[PDB]
Design a protein around this motif. Sequence first.
Motif, PDB file in Angstrom:
ATOM      1  N   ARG D  86      47.369  48.235  42.485  1.00  0.00           N
ATOM      2  CA  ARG D  86      46.218  49.013  42.082  1.00  0.00           C
ATOM      3  C   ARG D  86      45.340  48.176  41.161  1.00  0.00           C
ATOM      4  N   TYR D  87      45.942  47.558  40.137  1.00  0.00           N
ATOM      5  CA  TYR D  87      45.212  46.692  39.220  1.00  0.00           C
ATOM      6  C   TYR D  87      44.683  45.433  39.913  1.00  0.00           C
ATOM      7  N   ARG D  88      45.450  44.874  40.864  1.00  0.00           N
ATOM      8  CA  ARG D  88      45.029  43.720  41.649  1.00  0.00           C
ATOM      9  C   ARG D  88      43.722  44.002  42.389  1.00  0.00           C
ATOM     10  N   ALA D  89      43.630  45.153  43.062  1.00  0.00           N
ATOM     11  CA  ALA D  89      42.452  45.557  43.814  1.00  0.00           C
ATOM     12  C   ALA D  89      41.256  45.872  42.919  1.00  0.00           C
ATOM     13  N   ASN D  90      41.499  46.257  41.665  1.00  0.00           N
ATOM     14  CA  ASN D  90      40.438  46.590  40.729  1.00  0.00           C
ATOM     15  C   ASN D  90      39.818  45.332  40.131  1.00  0.00           C
ATOM     16  N   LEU D  91      40.647  44.334  39.802  1.00  0.00           N
ATOM     17  CA  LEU D  91      40.196  43.181  39.040  1.00  0.00           C
ATOM     18  C   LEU D  91      39.719  42.035  39.935  1.00  0.00           C
ATOM     19  N   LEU D  92      40.473  41.670  40.992  1.00  0.00           N
ATOM     20  CA  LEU D  92      40.218  40.435  41.736  1.00  0.00           C
ATOM     21  C   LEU D  92      39.204  40.620  42.868  1.00  0.00           C
ATOM     22  N   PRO D  93      38.423  39.572  43.244  1.00  0.00           N
ATOM     23  CA  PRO D  93      37.355  39.688  44.239  1.00  0.00           C
ATOM     24  C   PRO D  93      37.760  39.775  45.705  1.00  0.00           C
ATOM     25  N   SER D  94      38.927  39.223  46.029  1.00  0.00           N
ATOM     26  CA  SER D  94      39.367  39.050  47.402  1.00  0.00           C
ATOM     27  C   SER D  94      40.888  39.167  47.461  1.00  0.00           C
ATOM     28  N   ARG D  95      41.399  39.502  48.644  1.00  0.00           N
ATOM     29  CA  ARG D  95      42.828  39.562  48.882  1.00  0.00           C
ATOM     30  C   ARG D  95      43.424  38.168  49.084  1.00  0.00           C
ATOM     31  N   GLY D  96      42.592  37.121  49.193  1.00  0.00           N
ATOM     32  CA  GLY D  96      43.013  35.780  49.589  1.00  0.00           C
ATOM     33  C   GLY D  96      43.306  34.819  48.434  1.00  0.00           C
ATOM     34  N   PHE D  97      42.660  35.011  47.271  1.00  0.00           N
ATOM     35  CA  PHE D  97      42.748  34.062  46.163  1.00  0.00           C
ATOM     36  C   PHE D  97      42.521  34.731  44.802  1.00  0.00           C
ATOM     37  N   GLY D  98      42.835  33.996  43.723  1.00  0.00           N
ATOM     38  CA  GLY D  98      42.759  34.508  42.362  1.00  0.00           C
ATOM     39  C   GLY D  98      44.116  34.966  41.839  1.00  0.00           C
ATOM     40  N   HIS D  99      44.227  35.111  40.510  1.00  0.00           N
ATOM     41  CA  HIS D  99      45.500  35.422  39.875  1.00  0.00           C
ATOM     42  C   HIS D  99      45.361  36.535  38.836  1.00  0.00           C
ATOM     43  N   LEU D 100      46.291  37.496  38.900  1.00  0.00           N
ATOM     44  CA  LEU D 100      46.527  38.506  37.878  1.00  0.00           C
ATOM     45  C   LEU D 100      47.858  38.205  37.195  1.00  0.00           C
ATOM     46  N   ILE D 101      47.813  38.016  35.871  1.00  0.00           N
ATOM     47  CA  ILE D 101      48.934  37.563  35.066  1.00  0.00           C
ATOM     48  C   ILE D 101      49.582  38.739  34.341  1.00  0.00           C
ATOM     49  N   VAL D 102      50.920  38.764  34.377  1.00  0.00           N
ATOM     50  CA  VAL D 102      51.746  39.833  33.836  1.00  0.00           C
ATOM     51  C   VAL D 102      52.854  39.212  32.986  1.00  0.00           C
ATOM     52  N   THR D 103      53.111  39.790  31.807  1.00  0.00           N
ATOM     53  CA  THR D 103      54.209  39.380  30.943  1.00  0.00           C
ATOM     54  C   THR D 103      55.461  40.151  31.344  1.00  0.00           C
ATOM     55  N   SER D 104      56.620  39.477  31.317  1.00  0.00           N
ATOM     56  CA  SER D 104      57.886  40.036  31.780  1.00  0.00           C
ATOM     57  C   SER D 104      59.056  39.405  31.028  1.00  0.00           C
TER      58      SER D 104
END
Lengths: 142, 81, 101, 128, 140
Positions: D86-104
């Motif tokens: 859900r957050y991936r689709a909100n923040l990033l421009p395309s399904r092909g490239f870019g990164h969403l970073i998460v702490t774990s």
Amino acid sequence: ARMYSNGKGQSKSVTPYNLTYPTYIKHSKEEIVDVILNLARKGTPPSQIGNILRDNYGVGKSFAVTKTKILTLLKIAGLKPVIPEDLNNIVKKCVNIKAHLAKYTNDKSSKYQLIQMQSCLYRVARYYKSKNELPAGWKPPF
Amino acid sequence: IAKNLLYPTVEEIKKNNKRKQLFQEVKGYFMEVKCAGCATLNVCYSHSQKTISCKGCSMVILRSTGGKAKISNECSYMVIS
Amino acid sequence: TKKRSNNGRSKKNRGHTRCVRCEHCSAMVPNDKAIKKFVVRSVIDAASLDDLKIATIYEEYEVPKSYYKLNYCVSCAVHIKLVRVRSRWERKIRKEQRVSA
Amino acid sequence: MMDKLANLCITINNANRAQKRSVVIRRISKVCRLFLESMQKHGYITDIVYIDDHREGKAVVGLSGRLNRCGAICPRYDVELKDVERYRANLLPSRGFGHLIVTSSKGLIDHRECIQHNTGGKILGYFY
Amino acid sequence: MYGLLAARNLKKNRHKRRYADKDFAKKARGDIYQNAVGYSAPHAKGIVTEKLGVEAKQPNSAIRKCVRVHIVRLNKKVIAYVPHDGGLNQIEINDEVIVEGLGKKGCRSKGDIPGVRFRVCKVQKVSLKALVTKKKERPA
RNA sequence: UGAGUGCAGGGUUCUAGAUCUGAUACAAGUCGUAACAAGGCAGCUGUAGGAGAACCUGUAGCUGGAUCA
RNA sequence: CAUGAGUAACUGGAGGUCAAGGCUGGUGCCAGCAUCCGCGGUAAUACCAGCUCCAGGAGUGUCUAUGAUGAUUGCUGCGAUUAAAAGGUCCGUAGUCGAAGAACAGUACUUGUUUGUAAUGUGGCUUAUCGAGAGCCGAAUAGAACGAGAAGAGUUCAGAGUAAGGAGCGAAGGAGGGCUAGAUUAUUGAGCAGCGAGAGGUGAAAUUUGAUGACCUGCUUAGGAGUAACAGAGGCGAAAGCGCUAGUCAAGAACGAAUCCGAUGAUCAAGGACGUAGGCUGGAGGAUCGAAGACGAUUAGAGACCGUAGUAGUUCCAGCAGUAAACGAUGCCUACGCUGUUGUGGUUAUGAGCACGGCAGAAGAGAAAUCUAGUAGGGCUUUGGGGAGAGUACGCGCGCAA
Ligand SMILES: [K+]
Ligand SMILES: [K+]
Ligand SMILES: [K+]
Ligand SMILES: [K+]
Ligand SMILES: [K+]
Ligand SMILES: [K+]
Ligand SMILES: [K+]
Ligand SMILES: [K+]
Ligand SMILES: [K+]
Ligand SMILES: [K+]
Ligand SMILES: [K+]
Ligand SMILES: [K+]
Ligand SMILES: [K+]
Ligand SMILES: [K+]
Ligand SMILES: [K+]
Ligand SMILES: [K+]
Ligand SMILES: [K+]
Ligand SMILES: [K+]
Ligand SMILES: [K+]
Ligand SMILES: [K+]
Ligand SMILES: [K+]
Ligand SMILES: [K+]
Ligand SMILES: [K+]
Ligand SMILES: [K+]
Ligand SMILES: [K+]
Ligand SMILES: [K+]
Ligand SMILES: [K+]
Ligand SMILES: [Mg+2]
Ligand SMILES: [Mg+2]
Ligand SMILES: [Mg+2]
Ligand SMILES: [Mg+2]
Ligand SMILES: [Mg+2]
Ligand SMILES: [Mg+2]
Ligand SMILES: [Mg+2]
Ligand SMILES: [Mg+2]
Ligand SMILES: [Mg+2]
Ligand SMILES: [Mg+2]
Ligand SMILES: [Mg+2]
Ligand SMILES: [Mg+2]
Ligand SMILES: [Mg+2]
Ligand SMILES: [Mg+2]
Ligand SMILES: [Mg+2]
Ligand SMILES: [Mg+2]
Ligand SMILES: [Mg+2]
Ligand SMILES: [Zn+2]
Ligand SMILES: [Zn+2]
């Protein structure tokens, strides 16, 4: 910024990168430690101790020789004051303002300055009576 | 990276404020001053907050001011730290 | 809409200023807003200096001058034609006027 | 005081817009280091130096031509593995490239590694 | 109010904001049951007591035909409009009529008729459209 | 254990009322013309008097002014 | 399975939104139609009918609640210079939010295994001519039991000392404030002297004052306000505000530098202190100016504007009150950000800096005008949701009243 007014001054003094030992000086460790405890017993505040050590005896920041801080040395020697010296200087300024207003009752500017000063006292008191540095039922001299 | 950004020229160092640098710089230093006449040496701080008198002869050697302190007319000094 | 960047007055970094009174109608106007005019006028008119040269007892004489600073409110300055309405680009031009006599 | 991870992002975003190649960033924390080290792994930034000034800390960094934008999210929301797309689709421009970073519990990881390791975490920031 | 542990503050603030909406406000704080047709009922029965006419608003120029109705369910007396070409002729004093809404969000005037809020639907149990167009006759 | 019912009070919601006083709509009635042009005394905000009525007058302020001088 | 046969469409529309006629006849702002915009005053593609078309079709129109439309309720995701919208200024509790370095612990956090769902719903397969239907299968929410991981959050420490805060030192600057003692003129009023006819006021004049000597010029005095010119896109203060000279009393801002303590901090319902002017309660005083009131003119009328006169107020001390176009109509901390020029106060390797400003472009931004408005999920409080009614009614709290 400043706490009681709209100030944004920047005048401070730089702390060194490393501290070494002041080999250019002309006294031993034990002499410097004696000079401090004498100045203490005569009743000087610890910020003034620092000024004298720099200015007259030629030692910067007063720690490179002793491996210990000024207030900790005074607690080791047993010369600790009844009230921390910061809280002490706030009570003095309050007394002064109340002594002025006692004879010049008309001064609205001095009235303004007093309520600011008094607020600062209580904010400092609550710090110290959490670190067990004052009795819980301590109250101002007023 | 750029050499200009990681290693400034000494010209650039001297133009900046003492805090606004990659590493902050100490401006105060210690000196040995020698008195005219009696030729005794006194350790002093630049930027002194106190007026200072020569050991022995009691001539005022150094006068405190709003900035860097003022050595009396005849006296001379060397940086020691 | 806002017609002038300086609100038509020279006050900045202040709360309040002294008032002065208009020469023509005695209205109160703030000192930093009033239209100002300087005058340096000879006591004796130009049409008399040629008589003064035969009337005076002294070997030479310098006529005394009289000095004034006058203040006007907006309405009076416009009506007396010290100032005039100007176009949207002219409004921004600032130049010192002559001292009157 | 400003949030240190927010300050990092605005500093590099503005300098990139102004077409500079390098910057100095003035207040640094532990997660700021790990964020920059992430951008280096994916080739968004090239060179990193850290200055040990005894006053907080500061970094000097070289930008690549590949970086369009980065940003921090505040507050740091908790997410189940079910939530991250859900957050991936909100923040990033395309399904092909870019990164969403998460702490774990396994450090900083990207939205693909979340699927590999089978773990949610807390949302931290993004770049493309 | 955007902090991670701020939910309570945020909720109470956002709830209070909604009373600025006219719609939410009327449902909450107005008299929504005052009307013959509205929240209460889709249609209303009543008895005809007087025949009446009213001018249209400017710039139109007409006399609109209206009826005074006593409403059985509330004991209020209200004005209603009679729709069709010769419609007023199908109604006698002391007839029973069923009455209907004009179709706005709140009860509001429609077109050029000032201050009238309902219209006639049926007379003596039969459709007014059928009466006027002579497709059916009065019960007699 | 207690239903019912006396007598005082309260708490709620509706409703009557001589008379007074608001608001809204009044095709176009009567008296002036206060605002919009320097609108014929530049306008407006606070406060205090006065007045058929718009409003007028003192005092401090503002330009959204008729002046970036 | 076998016999007869030849029956079977309406509702809403046709000016635009919105698919489909300037067709023919009636009516002439009438009668009516129209959710909205709008039609009709004798040449109506919009009314009333005929005739042809359009749309859905065993169905189609209307009324009423609600979800969507709607980023017009905004967590994702709106606004607050001028459209509606930043509290007059501070202090402050509850509340929400809070450095670097080195370490530590597991309750939140995330995840495994196991429990926890008949119907409905979800992923499927199989049988009623078909399709809803019926029958069988698989997985599942929130909630709970036991383990695991330790980035973020949390707790501690001091051979660590923020372009975080408070205390203190040195030289200096300012219409910042209270008090004491003085000052050059000016405006009125009285006394006396000189002179002998007008003065004042206006666009132009009249009220009005003068032989009880005005006006103007001398000398004496008595009061109560004020600080001209210098004086500025200058300075100081939390804001409201502050301008003669000496002396005195407290505290604050900024700058220089190797002083001390160590998280003491940001913002703020409730609660508390200040707040031009005009107003009110008591005392002092009373020069100038002047609401109310009274005249003279001007006008159709002026009750007003103009002139003569005149009171409360305007000044001081002790208090109450609590509003302003209290405005740069731009909340407070904290960031990142192009150039040139000009100020104010300190410091200077004399190259420059630090704090507080003004101005002119640029680039971006914005409905534009323009820019306290550029970039941005940083923190916290106030606040708006089409015009009106209305910042009005009822209740309540403060105030002597207003
Ligand atoms: K300080
Ligand atoms: K504060
Ligand atoms: K303050
Ligand atoms: K402050
Ligand atoms: K003001
Ligand atoms: K001006
Ligand atoms: K209309
Ligand atoms: K007027
Ligand atoms: K039909
Ligand atoms: K037709
Ligand atoms: K026709
Ligand atoms: K709305
Ligand atoms: K939002
Ligand atoms: K207020
Ligand atoms: K520090
Ligand atoms: K003083
Ligand atoms: K007052
Ligand atoms: K009058
Ligand atoms: K008259
Ligand atoms: K008058
Ligand atoms: K007078
Ligand atoms: K008060
Ligand atoms: K008060
Ligand atoms: K207000
Ligand atoms: K300032
Ligand atoms: K805007
Ligand atoms: K009331
Ligand atoms: Mg007029
Ligand atoms: Mg006018
Ligand atoms: Mg205008
Ligand atoms: Mg069409
Ligand atoms: Mg039609
Ligand atoms: Mg909106
Ligand atoms: Mg407006
Ligand atoms: Mg507005
Ligand atoms: Mg406002
Ligand atoms: Mg089937
Ligand atoms: Mg942490
Ligand atoms: Mg005389
Ligand atoms: Mg002077
Ligand atoms: Mg200070
Ligand atoms: Mg007063
Ligand atoms: Mg605030
Ligand atoms: Mg509204
Ligand atoms: Zn000597
Ligand atoms: Zn004037």
